[PDB]
Design an enzyme around this catalytic site. Structure first.
Site, PDB file in Angstrom:
ATOM      1  N   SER B  42      13.362   4.280   1.114  1.00 16.29           N
ATOM      2  CA  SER B  42      14.696   4.862   0.601  1.00 16.29           C
ATOM      3  C   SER B  42      15.364   3.624   0.278  1.00 16.29           C
ATOM      4  O   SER B  42      16.475   3.635  -0.247  1.00 16.29           O
ATOM      5  CB  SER B  42      15.319   5.556   1.503  1.00 16.29           C
ATOM      6  OG  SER B  42      15.501   4.953   2.838  1.00 16.29           O
ATOM      7  N   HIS B 158       0.328  -2.853  12.180  1.00 10.77           N
ATOM      8  CA  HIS B 158      -0.276  -1.532  12.515  1.00 10.77           C
ATOM      9  C   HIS B 158      -1.314  -1.456  13.691  1.00 10.77           C
ATOM     10  O   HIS B 158      -1.858  -0.575  13.964  1.00 10.77           O
ATOM     11  CB  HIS B 158      -1.054  -0.973  11.275  1.00 10.77           C
ATOM     12  CG  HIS B 158      -0.095  -0.771  10.215  1.00 10.77           C
ATOM     13  ND1 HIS B 158      -0.554  -0.431   8.798  1.00 10.77           N
ATOM     14  CD2 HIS B 158       1.352  -0.653   9.894  1.00 10.77           C
ATOM     15  CE1 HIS B 158       0.498  -0.346   8.014  1.00 10.77           C
ATOM     16  NE2 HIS B 158       1.706  -0.453   8.723  1.00 10.77           N
ATOM     17  N   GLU B 167      -4.988  -4.379   7.010  1.00  8.79           N
ATOM     18  CA  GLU B 167      -6.413  -3.544   6.931  1.00  8.79           C
ATOM     19  C   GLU B 167      -7.602  -4.098   6.221  1.00  8.79           C
ATOM     20  O   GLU B 167      -7.482  -4.895   5.575  1.00  8.79           O
ATOM     21  CB  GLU B 167      -6.018  -2.275   6.199  1.00  8.79           C
ATOM     22  CG  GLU B 167      -5.267  -2.513   4.769  1.00  8.79           C
ATOM     23  CD  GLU B 167      -5.635  -1.129   3.834  1.00  8.79           C
ATOM     24  OE1 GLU B 167      -5.953  -0.221   4.558  1.00  8.79           O
ATOM     25  OE2 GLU B 167      -4.590  -1.070   2.757  1.00  8.79           O
ATOM     26  N   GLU B 210      -3.716   6.207   8.470  1.00 11.71           N
ATOM     27  CA  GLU B 210      -4.624   6.524   7.213  1.00 11.71           C
ATOM     28  C   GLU B 210      -6.016   6.646   7.539  1.00 11.71           C
ATOM     29  O   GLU B 210      -6.896   6.775   6.875  1.00 11.71           O
ATOM     30  CB  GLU B 210      -4.588   5.284   6.171  1.00 11.71           C
ATOM     31  CG  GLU B 210      -3.080   4.999   5.715  1.00 11.71           C
ATOM     32  CD  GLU B 210      -2.738   4.208   4.829  1.00 11.71           C
ATOM     33  OE1 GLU B 210      -3.421   3.122   4.714  1.00 11.71           O
ATOM     34  OE2 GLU B 210      -1.821   4.190   3.896  1.00 11.71           O
ATOM     35  N   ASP B 245      -6.708  -6.223   2.767  1.00  9.52           N
ATOM     36  CA  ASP B 245      -5.426  -6.101   2.644  1.00  9.52           C
ATOM     37  C   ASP B 245      -4.523  -6.951   3.647  1.00  9.52           C
ATOM     38  O   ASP B 245      -4.221  -6.643   4.728  1.00  9.52           O
ATOM     39  CB  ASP B 245      -4.955  -4.594   2.529  1.00  9.52           C
ATOM     40  CG  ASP B 245      -3.116  -4.761   2.098  1.00  9.52           C
ATOM     41  OD1 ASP B 245      -2.478  -5.554   1.862  1.00  9.52           O
ATOM     42  OD2 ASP B 245      -2.491  -3.689   2.582  1.00  9.52           O
ATOM     43  N   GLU B 298      -5.877  -8.059  -1.156  1.00  8.78           N
ATOM     44  CA  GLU B 298      -4.627  -7.551  -1.584  1.00  8.78           C
ATOM     45  C   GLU B 298      -3.649  -8.128  -0.837  1.00  8.78           C
ATOM     46  O   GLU B 298      -3.581  -8.571   0.408  1.00  8.78           O
ATOM     47  CB  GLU B 298      -4.539  -5.884  -1.248  1.00  8.78           C
ATOM     48  CG  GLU B 298      -3.449  -5.126  -1.591  1.00  8.78           C
ATOM     49  CD  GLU B 298      -3.406  -3.781  -1.291  1.00  8.78           C
ATOM     50  OE1 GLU B 298      -4.239  -3.363  -1.291  1.00  8.78           O
ATOM     51  OE2 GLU B 298      -2.094  -3.435  -0.828  1.00  8.78           O
ATOM     52  N   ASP B 324       0.469  -5.615  -4.625  1.00  6.62           N
ATOM     53  CA  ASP B 324       1.283  -4.635  -4.032  1.00  6.62           C
ATOM     54  C   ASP B 324       2.460  -4.660  -3.830  1.00  6.62           C
ATOM     55  O   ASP B 324       3.249  -4.356  -4.698  1.00  6.62           O
ATOM     56  CB  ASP B 324       0.196  -4.041  -2.744  1.00  6.62           C
ATOM     57  CG  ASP B 324       0.877  -2.726  -2.037  1.00  6.62           C
ATOM     58  OD1 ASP B 324       1.792  -2.102  -2.816  1.00  6.62           O
ATOM     59  OD2 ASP B 324       0.768  -2.642  -0.753  1.00  6.62           O
ATOM     60  N   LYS B 349       1.199   3.285  -7.294  1.00  6.72           N
ATOM     61  CA  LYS B 349       1.896   4.091  -6.180  1.00  6.72           C
ATOM     62  C   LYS B 349       2.845   4.955  -7.286  1.00  6.72           C
ATOM     63  O   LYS B 349       3.987   4.455  -7.423  1.00  6.72           O
ATOM     64  CB  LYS B 349       2.513   3.363  -4.933  1.00  6.72           C
ATOM     65  CG  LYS B 349       1.437   2.493  -4.056  1.00  6.72           C
ATOM     66  CD  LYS B 349       2.033   1.825  -3.015  1.00  6.72           C
ATOM     67  CE  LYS B 349       1.143   1.206  -1.957  1.00  6.72           C
ATOM     68  NZ  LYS B 349       1.697   0.165  -1.015  1.00  6.72           N
ATOM     69  N   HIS B 377      -3.236   5.484  -2.147  1.00  3.37           N
ATOM     70  CA  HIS B 377      -2.155   6.838  -1.337  1.00  3.37           C
ATOM     71  C   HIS B 377      -0.900   5.858  -0.548  1.00  3.37           C
ATOM     72  O   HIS B 377      -0.572   4.725  -0.904  1.00  3.37           O
ATOM     73  CB  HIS B 377      -3.007   7.119  -0.043  1.00  3.37           C
ATOM     74  CG  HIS B 377      -3.659   5.960   0.530  1.00  3.37           C
ATOM     75  ND1 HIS B 377      -3.471   4.699   0.592  1.00  3.37           N
ATOM     76  CD2 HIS B 377      -4.359   6.119   1.968  1.00  3.37           C
ATOM     77  CE1 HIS B 377      -4.087   3.923   1.429  1.00  3.37           C
ATOM     78  NE2 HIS B 377      -4.722   4.833   2.258  1.00  3.37           N
ATOM     79  N   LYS B 400      -7.891   3.836  -3.687  1.00  2.00           N
ATOM     80  CA  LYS B 400      -7.875   3.556  -2.206  1.00  2.00           C
ATOM     81  C   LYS B 400      -7.011   4.818  -1.452  1.00  2.00           C
ATOM     82  O   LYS B 400      -5.705   4.952  -1.927  1.00  2.00           O
ATOM     83  CB  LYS B 400      -7.325   2.378  -1.613  1.00  2.00           C
ATOM     84  CG  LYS B 400      -5.954   2.031  -1.734  1.00  2.00           C
ATOM     85  CD  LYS B 400      -5.623   0.473  -1.119  1.00  2.00           C
ATOM     86  CE  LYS B 400      -4.114   0.406  -0.587  1.00  2.00           C
ATOM     87  NZ  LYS B 400      -3.847  -0.905   0.150  1.00  2.00           N
TER      88      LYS B 400
HETATM   89  O1  LIG Z   1       1.710  -0.870   3.951  1.00  2.00           O
HETATM   90  C1  LIG Z   1       0.942  -0.442   2.487  1.00  2.00           C
HETATM   91  O2  LIG Z   1       0.777  -1.562   2.088  1.00  2.00           O
HETATM   92  C2  LIG Z   1       0.613   0.863   1.996  1.00  2.00           C
HETATM   93  C3  LIG Z   1      -0.721   1.380   2.201  1.00  2.00           C
HETATM   94  O3  LIG Z   1      -1.038   2.742   2.109  1.00  2.00           O
HETATM   95  O4  LIG Z   1       1.556   1.957   1.871  1.00  2.00           O
HETATM   96  P1  LIG Z   1       2.787   2.242   2.215  1.00  2.00           P
HETATM   97  O5  LIG Z   1       4.049   1.886   2.288  1.00  2.00           O
HETATM   98  O6  LIG Z   1       2.688   3.848   2.230  1.00  2.00           O
HETATM   99  O7  LIG Z   1       2.882   1.957   3.614  1.00  2.00           O
HETATM  100 MG   LIG Z   2      -0.695  -2.889   1.218  1.00  2.00          MG
END
Ligand SMILES: O=C(O)[C@@H](CO)OP(=O)(O)O
Ligand SMILES: [Mg+2]
Ligand SMILES: O=C(O)[C@@H](CO)OP(=O)(O)O
Ligand SMILES: [Mg+2]
Lengths: 439, 438
Positions: B42, B158, B167, B210, B245, B298, B324, B349, B377, B400
């Site tokens: 947001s 995470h 990840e 996830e 990632d 990534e 990303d 995305k 996702h 993914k």
């Molecule tokens: O953290 C991230 O890189 C991605 C993985 O899906 O998305 P999000 O913001 O939804 O967390």
């Molecule tokens: Mg990511």
């Protein structure tokens, strides 16, 4: 031969929420194609109708359902072509006879149920009704009610490495005024619980189990219940959320000694010997929990065939909702036994446990005629199918347990229930009314 | 006519993390078409932003009643009677109606829900499955089943472990079709689950947002070892590769220009070599690659460390380097990366940009440059399977969308299986990840 006639039946293997194969069945009529996915339980009562698995250890760890799929595609499907989807009982009975065994172990309860559900979906469309409404008419229910949802939030038993004997603790917003509010109350309480658990047990303690709940390393039920009271209190809903317990007591029962071990997971040198209980001692434990916590309901408080224990608890402590799960396996003959023996006052409904919608309706009818509670239920291995949401409303069961408010195989049901409520407008909410009727 | 929008209605649902999001229904002569929007940011400087209510007493401030009201009372009436086949016209109409560069007035979530449901209604109008309608709309004459990449081990923000990276995923690049790819990954995941239980205990098999695990590993090598072990146990050595990632912005110190691979390790237990400069970080990545079958990385560096991204891409021109946070599905950011030679693959995305039309454009840019394109996702997903049809119809070749666990993830993989079944002969991407204009 018209729009109501089955033109095509086709099954395929998909993956369930635990990542294991299960079956989905598509039935096509003049109204279109209708899809149903079949769930599957992590642990299953000894008496369930049986799902057919492939047993090929080289494929999906032996959990494939190619055989069930072929059964649908080359056996049940051919027998369904041309038939009228409106004839639910006729078609269900036909599949029962194809299989020819009491546990549906030939074609597979999973193969049969998939067809049963898609037949039903196609029929609702044939009548121009939403599924819940068709279910209501099919089963003679003139009134519908939004159910109280019960959400898995803390896990124990065979599902966690903690010392907690009971399989799960749920929160149930009996004090909400409608379903969308009930879901919000639970979601907020669940987020408050996540915060409490992170602070006390660490970040990794907020990873989730199969049903979306947490498995913190608690010392026993009292510590788990304290966490729920704490979360409910942080959320501001004290007095409007109650607690349901699923003991899954068969898991810690010793048939030979007649003992229930509440410390099965506790190392010998840390194990209070008081934790090994006879029936009276276990009863007293449950009563103690009831005195100190807002516990409204207890599921499988005793082992699946400890009829004497169930009866004693039911007549001596009937203030609790006492739910048969492993005791009953959604099976009308077991339900009849429990009624004769007065062994409980509520039944869990797991459709895939019995295998047809027709038999499920009968189980529910028996319960409702007796004024028992009826709680529609998910399985540990769920799918994106939302059938039970329509089922719980249409059959006017008034309770559903279908997961923490986490993981979409759970949320998809809760989302569907909100849609049903929005669409109906003025449908009442069950609140503290759990006992059923046939009205 | 049957192509005309007759009704637009949104409501608030819960996403896979239990937080509110929006779903939008559009009704035409062909019926009612529903789309659920995954959760997004947001706030932020470059991406489209979703609108949240910010009522602290309701869903912890995360309600989307305002976005819902925007669809029902502002966007909906502007859509009524419009022709669903005119995707670009309707998306541009909504963009202008919002009037802000980041869709922050009406909400990217409000707008995207409409964009997706318009598209579904249009596919039905043309009598086509969604993926096929999407291919037609974007001029793709060839479709390919994508390689799926599955979350398996969590680190960074995470997990409480020492693992720096956010990840690791497994990618069955050696499968011969999509059904087989999913099975390989499911079997490997179950093997990994067994390994983790044996080594770290039952509670270490509980899962993150996830669907992946968060075992208490000491670092990347221990994590990578677990994956190679799981892959060997499943019998797919040489057919499954690993994606990493890093989300390197998470451990980047902007003042010192250092990357701390031991952010979560107490000072007195901490190897001092873990704090690295760009060259040192590159060296570490290169070392993993020499010992483990790592096929893509990534966000290897922070979201604005252009010099580092360019250096890495130049020294490893052939290897999949995915933007990303660097790019946020934003055409202007993508162009900058292309101008600076900063990477060679982009995550997509849809909710980060807000309309299908702009999504098509970002993908088109990447395909013209021969970049990798990976549909992705969000952490908060829904039961909506749109991105499965999207990845196939736009010929992206990678997706993914979670571990093979949690149905907001499986519903995409299940849909991908259905699409393959329906098509029959469609090729599987395999080791071919670079996109083309064909
Ligand atoms: O953290 C991230 O890189 C991605 C993985 O899906 O998305 P999000 O913001 O939804 O967390
Ligand atoms: Mg990511
Ligand atoms: O045990 C239970 O009561 C339920 C889930 O809450 O099902 P399952 O059999 O599949 O675990
Ligand atoms: Mg149970």
């Amino acid at each position: 031969l018209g729009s109501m006639s089955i033109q095509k039946v086709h099954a395929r293997e998909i993956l369930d929420s635990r990542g294991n194969p299960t079956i989905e069945v598509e039935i096509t009529t003049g109204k279109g194609m209708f899809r149903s996915c079949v769930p599957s339980g992590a642990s299953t009562g000894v008496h369930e109708a049986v799902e057919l698995r492939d047993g090929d250890k080289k494929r999906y760890g032996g959990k494939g359902v190619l055989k069930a799929v072929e059964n649908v595609n080359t056996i049940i499907g051919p027998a369904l072509l041309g038939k009228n989807v409106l004839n639910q009982a006729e078609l269900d009975e036909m599949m029962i006879k194809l299989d020819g065994t009491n546990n549906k172990g030939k074609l597979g309860a999973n193969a049969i149920l998939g067809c049963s559900m898609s037949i039903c979906r196609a029929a609702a469309a044939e009548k121009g009704l939403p599924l819940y409404k068709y279910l209501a008419e099919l089963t003679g229910h003139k009134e519908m009610t939004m159910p109280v949802p019960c959400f898995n939030v803390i896990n124990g038993g065979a599902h966690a490495g903690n010392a907690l004997a009971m399989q799960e603790f749920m929160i149930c917003p009996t004090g909400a005024t409608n379903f969308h509010e009930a879901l919000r109350m639970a979601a907020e309480t669940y987020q408050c619980l996540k915060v409490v658990i992170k602070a006390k047990y660490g970040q990794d303690a907020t990873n989730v189990g199969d049903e979306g709940g947490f498995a913190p390393n608690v010392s026993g039920a009292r510590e788990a219940l304290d966490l729920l009271v704490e979360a409910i209190a942080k959320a501001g809903y004290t007095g409007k959320i109650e607690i349901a317990m699923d003991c899954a007591a068969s898991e810690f029962y010793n048939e030979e000694t007649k003992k229930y071990d509440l410390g099965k997971k506790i190392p010998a040198d840390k194990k209070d010997p008081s934790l090994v209980k006879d029936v009276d001692g276990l009863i007293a434990e449950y009563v103690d929990y009831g005195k100190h916590y807002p516990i409204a309901s207890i599921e499988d408080p005793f082992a699946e065939d400890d009829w004497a224990a169930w009866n004693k608890f039911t007549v001596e402590h009937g203030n609790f909702q006492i739910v048969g799960d492993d005791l009953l396996v959604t099976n009308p003959a077991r339900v009849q036994m429990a009624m004769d023996k007065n062994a409980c006052n509520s039944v869990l409904i797991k459709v895939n446990q019995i295998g047809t919608l027709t038999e499920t309706f009968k189980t529910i009818k028996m319960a409702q005629e007796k004024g028992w509670g009826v709680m529609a239920s998910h399985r540990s291995g769920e799918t994106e199918d939302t059938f039970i949401a329509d089922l719980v409303v249409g059959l006017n069961c008034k309770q559903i347990k279908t997961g923490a408010p986490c993981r979409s195989e759970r949320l998809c049901k809760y989302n569907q229930l909100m849609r049903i409520e929005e669409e109906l407008g003025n449908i009442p909410y069950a609140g503290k009314n759990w006992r059923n009727s046939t009205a």
